[PDB]
Amino acid sequence: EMEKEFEQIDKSGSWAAIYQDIRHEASDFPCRVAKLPKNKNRNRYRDVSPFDHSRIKLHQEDNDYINASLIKMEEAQRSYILTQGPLPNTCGHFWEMVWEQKSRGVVMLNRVMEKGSLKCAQYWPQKEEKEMIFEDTNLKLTLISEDIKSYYTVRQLELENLTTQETREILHFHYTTWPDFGVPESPASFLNFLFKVRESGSLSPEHGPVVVHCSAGIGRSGTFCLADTCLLLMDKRKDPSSVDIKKVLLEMRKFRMGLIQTADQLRFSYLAVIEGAKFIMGDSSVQDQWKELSHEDL
């Protein structure tokens, strides 16, 4: 049971060992497509690649490769697409994927610039009147509205397939205070954001999988998806004790390497699930407490 395991691990100071155990047990599958010479400039990081078996394929015959993985959680009945922060040459690919996979939401957990370096291309428009056209994939993207909070912003975007002139509304959930290789400022602040995404419908089964990314698409992105899946499993059976966080994480790592990049992100994942369990197990008021503690206004 996770709350007792947490205290035992905290007490023995063994988060690094638990986390290394996860790394050692984690799946290893081939990433041959990601490593083809022609895809070199489609990967942001040499040591973060999608597995062939779970990679998202673009529906184009030129080159279907994007650094993106489908994390299909069968028992939880939720899917996520985890991807790297788009590169200056893959922003068209990114929105092609969103279009083809029928996603409603994009969850961005990084800033464009972190630690003085560029982690992500500016892949969405920042001004309503300056829309973006991705000529290679023939898509148009317009900023419709934004709702800026103290540590996250929600944007309403309109994505248009210029070939057919079909349009879709995409919601962009941008977490702006979560450091690279770091953790959110509090469980309450993480959970407030996650439940904002949930409320939007972006994680729901009538849409394609939510697209989640940070810079590499494994650390913060893994923490977000791990917490979400654990809370959903707990919700399905109202049985917190039946949820084994580490096993869930190992399951997720069958679909993309390296999910959860530090032992402190693992520890934070436990904290977030433990605190989220209060809401799942019937204390609806805790959602308002998180919003208060998160100080989202201003």
Author numbering: 2 to 299
Give excerpts from the publication.
We therefore investigated the electron density near the WPD loop in the apo structure more closely. Surprisingly, upon closer inspection, the electron density strongly suggests a significant population for the open state as well (left). By contrast, when we re-refined 36 other available crystal structures of PTP1B complexed with active-site inhibitors using both open and closed loop states as putative alternative conformations, Fo-Fc difference electron density and the bimodal distribution of refined occupancies indicated the single-state models were a better fit. These results suggest that, even in the crystal, apo PTP1B samples both WPD loop states and that active-site inhibitors then lock the loop either fully open or fully closed. To better characterize the conformational heterogeneity of the WPD loop in apo PTP1B, we collected X-ray datasets at several elevated temperatures including 180 K, 240 K, and 278 K (‘room temperature’) in addition to the 100 K (‘cryogenic’) model from the PDB, all at better than 2 Å resolution. We built an initial multiconformer model for each temperature using the automated algorithm qFit. The WPD loop adopts both the open and closed conformations across this range and the population of the open vs. closed states was sensitive to temperature. The loop is approximately 67% closed at 100 K, but 65% open at 278 K. These occupancies evolve non-linearly at intermediate temperatures.
One system that would benefit immensely from an improved mechanistic understanding of allostery is the archetypal protein tyrosine phosphatase, PTP1B (also known as PTPN1). PTP1B is highly validated as a therapeutic target for diabetes and cancer and has also been linked to Rett syndrome. Transition of this loop from the open to the closed state is rate-limiting for catalysis. By exploiting a new multitemperature multiconformer X-ray approach, we have identified a collective allosteric network that is contiguous on the ‘back side’ of the protein, centered around the quasi-ordered α7 helix.
